[PDB]
Structure 1
Amino acid sequence: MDIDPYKEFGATVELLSFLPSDFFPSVRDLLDTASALYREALESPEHCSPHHTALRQAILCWGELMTLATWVGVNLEDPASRDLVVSYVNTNMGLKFRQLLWFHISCLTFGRETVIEYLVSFGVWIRTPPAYRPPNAPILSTLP
């Protein structure tokens, strides 16, 4: 059906592809950040924000996938098949959920426009050759 996860917010898969795949934090760190910062808002009966709705959906889907991983690990018999299944569900969709979690957590923390211009700036920085790339890569922060 070709739905873009970030089209409604303002980004695209291509804009999120400026950051290298290994730039994103791990799933556990992202989930801990989301909990610690917005547990009371992600466990509330109100539409706090489209970012909150997207985080709720993504967190439920990741819980779905983790229950799948536990179920296959504790029920399936073939050890090699179990290993490949768990590795796939932890890496291939792990990256796709790391991207969503990072995008929405960073948007809620700093600002959607701030995250968009940060994506553009980091694209510029990572595109600059290493010889002329300054050592200070752009970061999202509220401090001088």
Structure 2
Amino acid sequence: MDIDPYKEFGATVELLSFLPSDFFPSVRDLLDTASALYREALESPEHCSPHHTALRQAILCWGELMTLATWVGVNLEDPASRDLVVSYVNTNMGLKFRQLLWFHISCLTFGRETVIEYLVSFGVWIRTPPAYRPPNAPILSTLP
């Protein structure tokens, strides 16, 4: 099964590649935003939304990966190898889950259509070469 966790919603892994890897906030900041804005909804026993379901699952997924990495590192005896494996994790699983959490939190806060239009607009902005790129990058906001 070649499953794309976004085509269920309307985006694709290549639509989120418009945003660079250095754009997404850290996992700590994303989970803090989740606990701040959507905590009661996430622990509610209701199917509040597909975004809520996917977000619950993703949070538990990162919990499992962090448990595994912590146990492996605790049993590990070589700190250089520990740094290498934590860099590998943060590079691949870290980036993938930062993408997932950014997408779901933003679709909950501002809206799925707005998030997809923002993806297209930021793709345009980041494709435009710097000499002709506006200093005001596009951003999701509920204010003028």
Q: Same fold (TM over 0.5)?
A: yes
| 1:134 to partner: Cα distance | 0.7
| 1:140 to partner: Cα distance | 0.1
CA distance in 2, matches of 1:75, 1:54: 32
Is 1:45 matched with 2:45?
A: yes
Report the TM-score, using the length of structure 1 for normalisation. Answer: 0.96
CA distance in 2, matches of 1:30, 1:57: 15
| 1:72 to partner: Cα distance | 1.4
Partner deviation per Cα, 1:65-102 (whole Å, 9 max, x = no partner): 11112111211223333222222122221000000000
Report the TM-score, using the length of structure 2 for normalisation. Answer: 0.96
2:131 is paired with a residue whose SS is coil
Gaps of 5+ in 1: none
2:18 is paired with a residue whose SS is coil
Number of matched residues?
A: 144
Q: Which moved more, 1:65-74 or 1:18-27?
A: 65-74
CA distance in 1, matches of 2:30, 2:60: 14
Q: Which moved more, 1:81-90 or 1:116-125?
A: 81-90
Deviation >4 Å, runs of 4+: none
Identity %: 100
1:68 is paired with a residue whose SS is helix
CA distance in 1, matches of 2:60, 2:30: 14
| 1:44 to partner: Cα distance | 1.1
Q: Which moved more, 1:87-96 or 1:43-52?
A: 87-96
| 1:33 to partner: Cα distance | 0.4
1:13 is paired with a residue whose SS is coil
CA distance in 1, matches of 2:137, 2:84: 35
RMSD: 1.0
| 1:132 to partner: Cα distance | 1.1
